[PDB]
Amino acid sequence: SSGLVPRGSHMRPLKIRMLDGTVKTIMVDDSKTVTDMLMTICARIGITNHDEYSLVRELMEEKKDEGTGTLRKDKTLLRDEKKMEKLKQKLHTDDELNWLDHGRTLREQGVEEHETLLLRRKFFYSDQ
């Protein structure tokens, strides 16, 4: 290994978020399918399995609501015997999750590199 000159393939900085944690700035040596791209990324983070692990297009939160209700119409709730939502247990969101699969590229699916790529196992078995 002496004549290994970089910039051989197409390399780009990809916004990839670790599962349920945080997005990392990782470069990808992309050339083939989403497989080719993501397997590199997963190798950068020490993940080697995609049977349960698929990818989602993480749409960036550009519009965050300030509602918690309509507020203006009807000041509050006329009962208030129980506050069903004061705090949010389980950050369950399927809104930011726009799943994308393999058998194709990001080019085919019309998704650009500015889109954050979220990895998450839709098949998650840890209920014990």
Side-chain angles (χ1 to χ4, degrees):
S1 300
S2 302
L4 63 167
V5 183
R7 199 69 185 188
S9 311
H10 184 272
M11 60 175 59
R12 71 180 84 204
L14 215 292
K15 320 287 181 172
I16 39 88
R17 168 162 56 134
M18 275 53 274
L19 293 156
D20 67 87
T22 307
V23 47
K24 192 73 64 179
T25 312
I26 289 295
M27 60 71 51
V28 316
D29 193 275
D30 67 271
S31 46
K32 307 192 300 292
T33 43
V34 175
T35 305
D36 174 68
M37 185 181 304
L38 267 297
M39 68 175 299
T40 306
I41 303 173
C42 303
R44 312 302 282 176
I45 57 180
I47 292 181
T48 322
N49 60 277
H50 275 277
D51 182 80
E52 308 165 297
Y53 290 51
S54 187
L55 300 315
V56 335
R57 285 179 50 218
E58 183 187 315
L59 277 59
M60 286 175 291
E61 301 181 84
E62 310 166 299
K63 189 175 182 177
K64 200 65 168 298
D65 80 89
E66 300 180 81
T68 317
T70 188
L71 302 177
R72 179 59 169 138
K73 295 175 181 58
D74 286 277
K75 298 167 59 185
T76 189
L77 297 75
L78 191 62
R79 186 173 61 143
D80 63 272
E81 304 180 310
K82 178 66 64 174
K83 182 54 64 68
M84 62 293 180
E85 289 180 74
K86 186 188 67 179
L87 44 77
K88 187 180 184 180
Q89 292 303 92
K90 175 181 292 297
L91 302 180
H92 184 196
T93 173
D94 64 273
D95 184 90
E96 54 181 55
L97 277 69
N98 292 222
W99 291 97
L100 75 309
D101 295 74
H102 305 117
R104 52 191 175 234
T105 64
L106 296 185
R107 178 190 61 212
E108 309 302 285
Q109 301 175 91
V111 45
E112 298 298 293
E113 56 185 63
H114 66 257
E115 300 282 79
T116 310
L117 197 289
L118 189 275
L119 167 61
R120 186 158 300 179
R121 55 177 178 191
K122 53 177 62 170
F123 301 107
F124 55 100
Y125 305 98
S126 297
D127 182 69
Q128 50 174 330

XYZ file of all heavy atoms in Angstrom, residues 3-66:
505
model
N 0.791 3.388 -3.365
C 0.199 4.238 -4.376
C -1.293 4.397 -4.191
O -2.061 4.306 -5.148
N -1.710 4.626 -2.955
C -3.121 4.804 -2.653
C -3.458 6.292 -2.565
O -3.391 6.909 -1.500
C -3.534 4.056 -1.367
C -2.878 4.510 -0.050
C -3.614 3.905 1.133
C -1.410 4.118 0.006
N -3.795 6.867 -3.705
C -4.092 8.286 -3.790
C -5.591 8.519 -3.662
O -6.382 7.949 -4.416
C -3.581 8.886 -5.117
C -3.830 10.386 -5.170
C -2.102 8.583 -5.302
N -5.996 9.348 -2.688
C -7.408 9.675 -2.448
C -8.068 10.370 -3.640
O -7.423 10.631 -4.662
C -7.361 10.621 -1.242
C -6.031 10.387 -0.611
C -5.107 10.024 -1.733
N -9.358 10.674 -3.488
C -10.156 11.307 -4.541
C -10.299 10.359 -5.735
O -10.531 10.785 -6.867
C -9.525 12.643 -4.974
C -10.483 13.577 -5.698
C -11.561 14.112 -4.765
N -12.556 14.916 -5.478
C -13.511 15.629 -4.879
N -13.535 15.741 -3.557
N -14.432 16.254 -5.608
N -10.173 9.063 -5.469
C -10.300 8.070 -6.517
C -11.746 7.853 -6.903
O -12.081 7.768 -8.084
N -12.604 7.765 -5.902
C -14.031 7.636 -6.129
C -14.716 8.962 -5.828
O -14.052 9.990 -5.665
C -14.609 6.543 -5.231
O -13.846 5.352 -5.308
N -16.037 8.943 -5.764
C -16.787 10.119 -5.362
C -16.956 10.106 -3.851
O -17.588 9.211 -3.299
C -18.156 10.152 -6.048
C -18.945 11.390 -5.750
N -19.784 11.506 -4.665
C -19.014 12.574 -6.403
C -20.332 12.706 -4.663
N -19.882 13.374 -5.707
N -16.378 11.084 -3.186
C -16.463 11.159 -1.738
C -17.184 12.425 -1.313
O -16.867 13.522 -1.774
C -15.074 11.085 -1.099
C -14.125 12.192 -1.525
S -12.558 12.122 -0.638
C -11.987 10.486 -1.091
N -18.164 12.261 -0.446
C -18.974 13.382 0.005
C -19.189 13.303 1.511
O -19.207 12.210 2.078
C -20.335 13.369 -0.705
C -21.233 12.235 -0.242
C -22.574 12.225 -0.947
N -22.509 11.549 -2.242
C -23.357 11.770 -3.246
N -24.265 12.737 -3.154
N -23.279 11.040 -4.352
N -19.326 14.452 2.187
C -19.722 14.483 3.591
C -21.221 14.231 3.735
O -22.041 14.983 3.207
C -19.357 15.900 4.035
C -19.426 16.724 2.792
C -19.092 15.804 1.644
N -21.580 13.163 4.426
C -22.978 12.791 4.569
C -23.427 12.989 6.012
O -22.724 12.608 6.952
C -23.177 11.331 4.134
C -24.504 11.010 3.424
C -25.687 11.143 4.371
C -24.691 11.916 2.215
N -24.584 13.610 6.178
C -25.158 13.823 7.497
C -25.873 12.552 7.946
O -27.022 12.326 7.578
C -26.168 14.977 7.461
C -25.747 16.164 6.603
C -24.631 16.978 7.238
C -24.260 18.162 6.359
N -23.310 19.090 7.026
N -25.196 11.713 8.712
C -25.787 10.456 9.153
C -25.959 10.427 10.664
O -25.011 10.631 11.407
C -24.957 9.237 8.681
C -23.447 9.503 8.778
C -25.332 8.857 7.262
C -22.843 9.164 10.123
N -27.174 10.194 11.127
C -27.415 10.148 12.559
C -27.340 8.727 13.083
O -27.924 7.804 12.507
C -28.760 10.781 12.937
C -29.158 10.493 14.383
C -30.225 11.441 14.898
N -31.429 11.453 14.076
C -32.667 11.383 14.557
N -32.877 11.262 15.864
N -33.692 11.433 13.718
N -26.607 8.562 14.174
C -26.542 7.294 14.868
C -27.887 6.960 15.469
O -28.335 7.647 16.381
C -25.495 7.338 15.977
C -24.070 7.031 15.534
S -23.495 8.039 14.148
C -24.094 7.091 12.749
N -28.522 5.943 14.888
C -29.747 5.310 15.390
C -30.713 6.235 16.129
O -31.663 6.758 15.539
C -29.372 4.109 16.240
C -28.737 2.980 15.438
C -27.884 2.112 16.328
C -29.809 2.148 14.752
N -30.480 6.429 17.411
C -31.413 7.172 18.248
C -30.687 8.284 18.980
O -31.234 8.919 19.885
C -32.091 6.236 19.256
C -31.129 5.685 20.294
O -30.923 6.345 21.336
O -30.557 4.596 20.065
N -29.466 8.540 18.554
C -28.625 9.470 19.254
C -28.399 10.751 18.494
O -29.233 11.654 18.522
N -27.272 10.834 17.812
C -26.850 12.074 17.207
C -26.300 11.866 15.794
O -25.731 10.819 15.490
C -25.767 12.716 18.084
O -26.236 12.840 19.434
C -25.393 14.070 17.545
N -26.485 12.868 14.934
C -25.923 12.844 13.590
C -24.422 13.122 13.616
O -23.950 14.010 14.324
C -26.630 13.845 12.650
C -26.774 15.184 13.326
C -25.881 13.991 11.331
N -23.685 12.337 12.852
C -22.245 12.467 12.754
C -21.868 12.907 11.346
O -22.503 12.503 10.369
C -21.586 11.121 13.055
C -20.080 11.195 13.254
C -19.723 11.826 14.590
C -20.218 10.980 15.754
N -19.856 11.571 17.070
N -20.857 13.746 11.239
C -20.316 14.105 9.944
C -19.349 13.025 9.466
O -18.217 12.927 9.948
C -19.586 15.458 10.000
O -20.407 16.422 10.674
C -19.254 15.953 8.600
N -19.812 12.200 8.543
C -19.003 11.120 8.001
C -18.942 11.228 6.485
O -19.956 11.480 5.835
C -19.575 9.736 8.408
C -19.356 9.478 9.901
C -18.958 8.614 7.582
C -17.899 9.369 10.295
N -17.755 11.069 5.922
C -17.615 11.068 4.480
C -17.954 9.693 3.943
O -17.794 8.687 4.636
C -16.205 11.504 4.034
C -15.048 10.637 4.536
S -14.959 8.996 3.779
C -15.044 9.407 2.037
N -18.453 9.645 2.728
C -18.771 8.378 2.112
C -18.065 8.253 0.774
O -17.970 9.222 0.015
C -20.297 8.180 1.936
C -21.036 8.607 3.189
C -20.824 8.943 0.741
N -17.524 7.079 0.518
C -16.915 6.775 -0.764
C -17.980 6.150 -1.650
O -17.989 4.941 -1.893
C -15.722 5.834 -0.563
C -14.830 5.700 -1.787
O -15.142 4.864 -2.666
O -13.840 6.457 -1.900
N -18.920 6.984 -2.073
C -20.102 6.508 -2.777
C -19.807 6.246 -4.245
O -19.090 7.007 -4.898
C -21.275 7.493 -2.634
C -21.053 8.826 -3.331
O -20.500 9.754 -2.705
O -21.473 8.972 -4.497
N -20.344 5.148 -4.748
C -20.161 4.781 -6.139
C -21.358 3.994 -6.665
O -21.812 4.217 -7.789
C -18.870 3.973 -6.295
O -18.764 2.972 -5.291
N -21.879 3.092 -5.844
C -22.967 2.221 -6.265
C -24.267 2.564 -5.532
O -24.558 3.736 -5.285
C -22.588 0.755 -6.024
C -21.255 0.350 -6.634
C -21.060 -1.160 -6.615
C -21.077 -1.727 -5.200
N -19.894 -1.303 -4.402
N -25.038 1.531 -5.207
C -26.345 1.672 -4.558
C -26.271 2.342 -3.183
O -25.188 2.636 -2.672
C -26.990 0.288 -4.381
O -26.004 -0.646 -3.917
C -27.603 -0.202 -5.684
N -27.446 2.561 -2.584
C -27.534 3.021 -1.199
C -26.783 2.051 -0.292
O -26.215 2.437 0.726
C -29.009 3.134 -0.732
C -29.096 3.498 0.742
C -29.762 4.158 -1.565
N -26.781 0.785 -0.692
C -26.028 -0.244 -0.028
C -24.553 0.133 0.060
O -23.984 0.207 1.149
C -26.171 -1.543 -0.827
O -27.555 -1.866 -0.991
C -25.462 -2.675 -0.141
N -23.967 0.394 -1.102
C -22.556 0.759 -1.228
C -22.212 1.965 -0.359
O -21.180 1.991 0.318
C -22.257 1.060 -2.698
C -20.857 1.583 -2.943
O -19.893 0.815 -2.767
O -20.721 2.755 -3.354
N -23.090 2.951 -0.364
C -22.880 4.164 0.412
C -23.005 3.885 1.910
O -22.099 4.193 2.687
C -23.887 5.235 -0.006
C -23.669 6.575 0.677
S -24.894 7.808 0.192
C -24.699 7.797 -1.589
N -24.117 3.278 2.303
C -24.428 3.087 3.714
C -23.534 2.052 4.383
O -23.240 2.174 5.571
C -25.901 2.711 3.907
C -26.837 3.892 4.171
C -26.457 4.583 5.471
C -26.807 4.885 3.017
N -23.093 1.038 3.642
C -22.231 0.013 4.229
C -20.897 0.628 4.635
O -20.288 0.223 5.622
C -22.007 -1.166 3.270
C -21.177 -0.832 2.041
S -20.825 -2.285 1.029
C -19.894 -3.283 2.195
N -20.469 1.630 3.878
C -19.271 2.376 4.203
C -19.472 3.138 5.514
O -18.685 3.006 6.448
C -18.922 3.361 3.069
O -18.846 2.653 1.823
C -17.598 4.066 3.337
N -20.557 3.903 5.571
C -20.940 4.662 6.759
C -21.020 3.767 7.994
O -20.491 4.104 9.053
C -22.311 5.339 6.552
C -22.272 6.243 5.320
C -22.705 6.134 7.789
C -23.619 6.811 4.932
N -21.673 2.624 7.848
C -21.838 1.696 8.955
C -20.492 1.117 9.376
O -20.275 0.820 10.548
C -22.814 0.584 8.580
S -24.439 1.195 8.078
N -19.582 0.980 8.424
C -18.231 0.527 8.724
C -17.463 1.606 9.475
O -16.549 1.312 10.242
C -17.503 0.137 7.448
N -17.843 2.861 9.256
C -17.205 3.983 9.935
C -17.614 4.019 11.409
O -16.907 4.579 12.246
C -17.590 5.320 9.278
C -17.471 5.346 7.758
C -16.060 5.031 7.284
N -15.158 6.174 7.430
C -13.854 6.139 7.153
N -13.274 5.000 6.787
N -13.134 7.249 7.251
N -18.759 3.416 11.718
C -19.311 3.465 13.069
C -19.353 2.085 13.728
O -19.819 1.947 14.861
C -20.730 4.071 13.072
C -21.653 3.271 12.144
C -20.680 5.534 12.657
C -23.070 3.798 12.081
N -18.884 1.066 13.020
C -18.798 -0.263 13.602
C -20.135 -0.986 13.646
O -20.441 -1.680 14.612
N -20.933 -0.814 12.607
C -22.191 -1.531 12.474
C -22.140 -2.423 11.237
O -21.815 -1.958 10.142
C -23.388 -0.553 12.387
C -23.572 0.172 13.726
C -24.666 -1.278 11.986
C -24.745 1.130 13.751
N -22.426 -3.705 11.411
C -22.327 -4.654 10.313
C -23.564 -5.553 10.249
O -23.489 -6.745 10.550
C -21.067 -5.528 10.457
O -19.975 -4.736 10.952
C -20.678 -6.143 9.121
N -24.699 -4.964 9.877
C -25.962 -5.697 9.758
C -27.079 -4.752 9.331
O -27.168 -3.623 9.811
C -26.326 -6.406 11.078
C -26.490 -5.459 12.254
O -25.513 -5.061 12.888
N -27.727 -5.136 12.586
N -27.916 -5.207 8.404
C -28.993 -4.379 7.871
C -30.274 -5.171 7.645
O -31.196 -4.684 6.996
C -28.572 -3.711 6.561
C -27.830 -2.431 6.761
N -28.464 -1.232 6.984
C -26.506 -2.166 6.781
C -27.562 -0.282 7.131
N -26.364 -0.821 7.015
N -30.342 -6.382 8.175
C -31.566 -7.173 8.079
C -32.690 -6.484 8.848
O -33.812 -6.337 8.355
C -31.344 -8.587 8.621
C -32.580 -9.456 8.498
O -32.831 -9.984 7.394
O -33.308 -9.612 9.497
N -32.366 -6.046 10.056
C -33.305 -5.308 10.888
C -33.133 -3.809 10.670
O -34.036 -3.018 10.946
C -33.056 -5.634 12.360
C -33.040 -7.121 12.667
C -32.432 -7.417 14.021
O -31.234 -7.129 14.220
O -33.162 -7.925 14.901
N -31.962 -3.432 10.162
C -31.590 -2.029 10.044
C -31.800 -1.505 8.633
O -31.092 -1.886 7.701
C -30.126 -1.822 10.433
C -29.828 -2.008 11.907
C -30.242 -3.145 12.588
C -29.121 -1.044 12.613
C -29.966 -3.314 13.927
C -28.838 -1.208 13.956
C -29.265 -2.345 14.608
O -28.990 -2.513 15.946
N -32.748 -0.607 8.492
C -32.985 0.059 7.226
C -32.699 1.545 7.406
O -32.374 1.981 8.512
C -34.423 -0.181 6.750
O -34.632 0.329 5.442
N -32.802 2.320 6.342
C -32.446 3.723 6.422
C -33.680 4.589 6.269
O -34.627 4.218 5.579
C -31.409 4.101 5.354
C -30.066 3.354 5.410
C -29.539 3.289 6.837
C -30.181 1.959 4.809
N -33.685 5.733 6.925
C -34.769 6.678 6.760
C -34.207 8.031 6.351
O -33.115 8.419 6.774
C -35.640 6.832 8.046
C -35.573 5.589 8.913
C -35.258 8.060 8.854
N -34.927 8.722 5.492
C -34.611 10.096 5.177
C -35.094 10.977 6.306
O -36.298 11.107 6.529
C -35.270 10.518 3.870
C -34.599 9.962 2.627
C -35.336 10.403 1.377
N -35.573 11.847 1.373
C -36.689 12.415 0.920
N -37.659 11.667 0.409
N -36.835 13.733 0.987
N -34.158 11.552 7.028
C -34.475 12.389 8.161
C -34.686 13.818 7.699
O -33.726 14.539 7.414
C -33.353 12.327 9.192
C -33.635 13.113 10.456
C -32.433 13.169 11.369
O -31.791 12.120 11.580
O -32.113 14.267 11.864
N -35.942 14.209 7.583
C -36.264 15.574 7.222
C -35.937 16.496 8.379
O -36.363 16.269 9.513
C -37.731 15.731 6.823
C -38.067 15.376 5.369
C -37.694 13.939 5.045
C -39.546 15.609 5.104
N -35.178 17.529 8.085
C -34.720 18.448 9.110
C -35.869 19.308 9.602
O -36.703 19.756 8.810
C -33.568 19.304 8.588
C -32.266 18.529 8.469
S -30.934 19.484 7.716
C -31.533 19.612 6.034
N -35.914 19.516 10.909
C -37.014 20.228 11.533
C -36.907 21.722 11.259
O -36.247 22.459 11.989
C -37.050 19.948 13.037
C -37.211 18.470 13.367
C -37.266 18.198 14.856
O -38.360 18.325 15.450
O -36.215 17.872 15.444
N -37.541 22.143 10.177
C -37.538 23.539 9.771
C -38.746 24.243 10.358
O -38.732 25.451 10.585
C -37.581 23.637 8.246
C -36.546 22.773 7.551
C -36.821 22.631 6.071
O -37.891 22.095 5.715
O -35.967 23.039 5.258
N -39.791 23.472 10.605
C -41.031 24.018 11.119
C -41.467 23.260 12.367
O -42.021 22.162 12.286
C -42.115 23.958 10.041
C -43.390 24.697 10.407
C -44.379 24.701 9.255
C -45.637 25.477 9.601
N -46.575 25.555 8.450
N -41.170 23.838 13.519
C -41.562 23.261 14.794
C -42.715 24.070 15.380
O -42.612 25.293 15.515
C -40.370 23.261 15.754
C -40.500 22.286 16.912
C -40.520 20.849 16.417
C -40.365 19.858 17.557
N -39.060 20.015 18.256
N -43.806 23.398 15.717
C -45.007 24.080 16.188
C -44.828 24.600 17.609
O -43.968 24.129 18.357
C -46.233 23.155 16.129
C -46.317 22.196 17.303
O -46.912 22.560 18.339
O -45.772 21.076 17.203
N -45.644 25.579 17.963
C -45.645 26.149 19.303
C -47.043 26.031 19.891
O -47.465 26.850 20.709
C -45.229 27.622 19.254
C -43.844 27.858 18.675
C -43.483 29.327 18.637
O -43.059 29.864 19.680
O -43.634 29.956 17.572
